[PDB]
């Protein structure tokens, strides 16, 4: 035993407070500071190609692959029910309430979230962040600050592309061989869709799912051992932490504004 049993558990609690204490201190210095507007204007466009444009290929090709499986499995469960006209309340309602900012955030941490951690880790082994301190400029405002604002405005923008292609992907597998018309599928979809219910509430949960993903990708890229094994250890660490921050916050965001 009882005296030596706390020697392995009590020491981990001290390093846990130092881990989360350095993430909030790094984000406070990267945002609150000098309002660099004209200087950070070409930096936001450069950090939008590898985050918004290069990660746009995976979500587009998976948007048609998330509606053609959901729309095909949803047809067999509604068999012998005379409810074939109510397909819009299953392929478009579950892609906006349950799916949407959950599946696209898991693909954001693999393509854009994983590459953002390895980009700062490769510059830390070559000591490129330490060379910014010798040039009398802030390293947290030049290499961290344009990368945080470029990820918080891209994932709500990439969520709408995941929904609209997935809605059209459900219509692609819908009228393909079933014989249904294009008037019954777009009839039940207009019901229970209005302001501050499903379209706005999907955008509310999307920006919360964009801060918590990009916070881990910038912290583990800044807190890593500059060697060949420290970059690869922090690269796979952000995928596990974002999988528990997106799915772990799904139970919290469902209790508020059901639907």
């Amino acid at each position: 035993m009882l005296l030596n049993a706390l020697a392995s558990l009590g020491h981990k609690g001290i390093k846990t407070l130092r881990t989360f204490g350095r993430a909030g201190l790094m984000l406070f210095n990267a945002l609150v500071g000098k309002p660099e507007f004209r200087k950070h204007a070409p930096l936001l466009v450069r950090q939008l190609y590898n985050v918004g444009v290069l990660s746009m290929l995976i979500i587009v090709v998976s948007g048609v692959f998330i509606g053609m499986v959901l729309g095909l499995q949803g047809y067999l469960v509604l068999t012998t029910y005379s409810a074939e006209t109510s397909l819009g309340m299953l392929v478009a309602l579950s892609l906006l309430r349950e799916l949407g900012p959950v599946v696209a955030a898991l693909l954001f941490a693999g393509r854009a979230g994983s590459a953002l951690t390895a980009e700062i880790g490769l510059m830390r082994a070559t000591e490129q962040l330490s060379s910014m301190e010798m040039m009398a400029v802030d390293p947290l405002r030049r290499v961290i600050s344009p990368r945080f604002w470029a990820g918080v405005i891209s994932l709500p923008l990439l969520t709408v592309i995941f929904v609209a292609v997935g809605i059209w992907g459900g219509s692609l597998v819908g009228v393909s061989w079933k014989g249904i018309d294009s008037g019954f599928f777009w009839s039940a979809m207009q019901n229970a869709v209005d302001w501050r219910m499903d379209l706005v509430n999907c955008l509310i949960k999307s920006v919360v799912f964009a801060i918590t993903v990009t916070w881990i990708s910038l912290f583990n890229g800044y807190d890593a051992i500059p060697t060949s094994a420290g970059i690869s250890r922090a690269t796979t660490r952000t995928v596990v932490h974002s999988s528990l921050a997106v799915l772990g916050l799904d139970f919290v965001l469902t209790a508020l504004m059901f639907g």
Binding site: G52, L157, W186
Partner: protein, 149 residues
């Protein structure tokens, strides 16, 4: 560092998300105007609402002309009072009307169906007019026992 290539793909990405917003608001959603045109509240009493819930659409002749904001209960007469929302385009509702709550299909929701009446050569409806020619809803517990008896 090339500004001639990265600035083009940003506008492609911005128009890919702008066209995706117009696909979920015009094809998936049936909202176009964000105006704030008000309406007048009409009071009506009943005896049994059945399965009437909040935000139920009200129709007069089959076309939806409004909805229901909320429903209250009278603490004195113990009767349910249903509020209505009718647009101010044209009403022409006399005092000889008949309100009847109906349903769509068999497993659908309940809606209020306003039936117009005739006039004799009866006044004009105003904000807060109440009538007593309201039809109550029917359930399955009353029509089955009356069919065998």
């Amino acid at each position: 560092m090339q500004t001639k290539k990265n600035e083009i793909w940003v506008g492609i990405f911005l128009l890919a998300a702008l066209l995706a917003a117009l696909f979920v608001c015009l094809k998936a959603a049936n909202v176009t105007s964000i105006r704030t045109e008000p309406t007048y509240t009409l009071y009506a009493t009943f005896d049994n609402i059945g399965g009437l819930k909040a935000r139920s659409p009200v129709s007069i002749g089959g076309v939806v002309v409004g909805r229901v904001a909320d429903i209250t209960l009278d603490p004195k007469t113990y009767l349910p009072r249903v509020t209505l929302e009718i647009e101010q385009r044209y009403n022409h509702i006399p005092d000889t009307s008949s309100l009847s709550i109906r349903t769509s299909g068999l497993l659908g929701e309940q809606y209020l169906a306003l039936n117009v009446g005739f006039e004799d050569p009866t006044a004009i409806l105003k904000d807060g007019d109440t009538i007593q020619d309201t039809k109550s809803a029917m359930v399955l517990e009353d029509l089955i026992g009356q069919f065998l008896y």
